[PDB]
């Protein structure tokens, strides 16, 4: 029924701009104040705009202002967001929202990335020791950019101790780890081999460990 | 700007269990209050709007009360679905604020964690850099302190920490400690110490590596 569509997020440079767009649908847009809502990574919520139906009066975050437009064609069901001068603070999930007094619509959500890094595939790197009858390997997926990586153990066969962790963003590049536990009897007579994807630079890395 | 306050910042909890997470605003609001739910990739979903009212197709088993600036939230029968984070937010003046968050999480035994320490990989070596990696994994309470020591010192320079979401199979926690250097500067030092210090112990786990063996 009530439909809210963003597009035009992605990776940006620091200091250029982007347009987000919010397509909608199963409702008379013109009819309702419209909201745009950004979240940070491991951050909370933040209000960033909010546009009347008739576009009379409009209100900013006070970390936008002066920065950003909201703007919409009621004629053509759209909201948009113009951001200027980006900074990395900027890097959040996107969300164009309906505030009713009982309900609330939200879109999708587009990511909007600052970085001035470019497309980087992945260095795959093994994780090998140099009692709990137990023996911890890994991976290091260093310097990869942009989000997301896939990582599995034995194609996918091999679930049970398995740890991804969240990845970590330093000088524009991602890094993650992944651990995987195994009973000490079972390596390395039975084959431990961690498959990396990063589909941005079409990467399938497979890397046995020892 | 209302500032809005959340209290605990996160509640370890049983299925079955009821719960009852508070909220603060710095003024009055007059019951302009929303409570949401989130879920990791996903968008927040409104639970209860106007303080008390619970939204349309929402489970019976969520509710909220206040009274002026004080406000809670309560689930009656925690179901395995309801862990995730808990915000509340305020409409009652632009801009429209919301809370910290409160993270359910499943309360369960505590458990040591199992450290392990990496050396730099001989294939990373050759490229002129070289990554250190500490695992400590499955441990319980969440709050942990793990560091690197390099010849004795505490190096935070290039350290990069990240702690998994609670695990579905044990319910405990894990987390991943990398230390990135050249390998100029990995040279210039012998001794790498990852030491993580948990309730669990009061003595440190101590897991180290020398760069010559």
């Known amino acids: 029924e009530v439909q809210l569509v963003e597009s035009g997020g992605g990776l940006v440079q620091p200091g250029k701009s982007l347009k987000l767009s919010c397509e909608a649908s199963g409702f008379t847009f013109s009819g309702y104040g419209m909201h745009w809502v950004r979240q940070a990574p491991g951050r909370g919520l933040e209000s960033v705009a909010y546009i009347t139906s008739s576009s009379i009066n409009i209100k900013y975050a006070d970390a936008v202002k002066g920065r950003f437009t909201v703007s919409r064609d009621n004629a053509k069901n759209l909201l948009f967001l113009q951001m200027n001068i980006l900074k990395s603070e900027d890097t959040a999930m996107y969300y164009c929202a309906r505030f009713d007094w009982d309900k609330n619509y939200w879109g999708q959500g587009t990511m909007v990335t600052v970085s001035s890094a470019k497309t980087t595939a992945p260095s795959v790197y093994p994780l090998a020791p140099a009692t709990t009858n137990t023996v911890t390997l890994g991976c290091l997926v260093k310097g990869y950019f942009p989000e997301p990586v896939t990582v599995i153990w034995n194609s996918g066969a091999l679930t049970s101790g398995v740890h991804t962790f969240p990845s970590v963003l330093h000088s524009g590049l991602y890094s993650l780890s992944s651990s995987v536990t195994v009973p000490s009897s079972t390596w390395p007579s039975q084959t431990v081999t961690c498959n990396v994807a990063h589909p941005a630079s079409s990467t399938t890395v497979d890397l046995k460990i020892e | 700007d209302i500032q809005m306050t959340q209290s605990p910042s996160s509640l370890p909890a049983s299925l079955g269990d009821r719960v009852t997470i508070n909220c603060q605003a710095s003024?009055?609001?007059?019951?302009?209050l929303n409570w949401y739910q989130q879920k990791p990739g996903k968008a927040p979903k409104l639970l209860i709007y106007?303080?008390?009212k619970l939204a349309d197709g929402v489970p019976s088993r969520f509710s909220g009360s206040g009274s002026g600036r004080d406000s809670s939230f309560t689930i009656s029968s925690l179901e395995s679905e309801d862990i995730g984070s808990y915000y509340c937010?305020?409409?009652?003046?632009?801009?429209?604020?919301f809370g910290p968050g409160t993270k359910l999480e499943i309360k369960r035994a505590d458990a040591k964690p199992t450290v392990s320490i990496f050396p730099p990989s001989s294939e990373q070596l050759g490229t002129g850099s070289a990554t250190l990696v500490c695992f400590v994994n499955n441990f319980y309470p969440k709050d942990i302190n793990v560091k690197w020591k390099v010849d004795g010192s505490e190096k935070r320079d290039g350290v990069l920490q990240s702690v998994t979401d609670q695990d579905s199979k044990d319910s405990t926690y894990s987390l991943s400690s990398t230390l990135s250097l050249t390998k100029a500067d990995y040279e210039r030092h012998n001794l790498y110490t990852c030491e993580v210090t948990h309730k669990t112990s009061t003595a440190a786990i101590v897991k180290t590596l020398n760069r010559n063996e």
């Open positions: 003024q009055d609001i007059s019951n302009y």
């Open positions: 937010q305020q409409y009652y003046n632009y801009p429209w604020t």
């Open positions: 106007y303080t008390n």
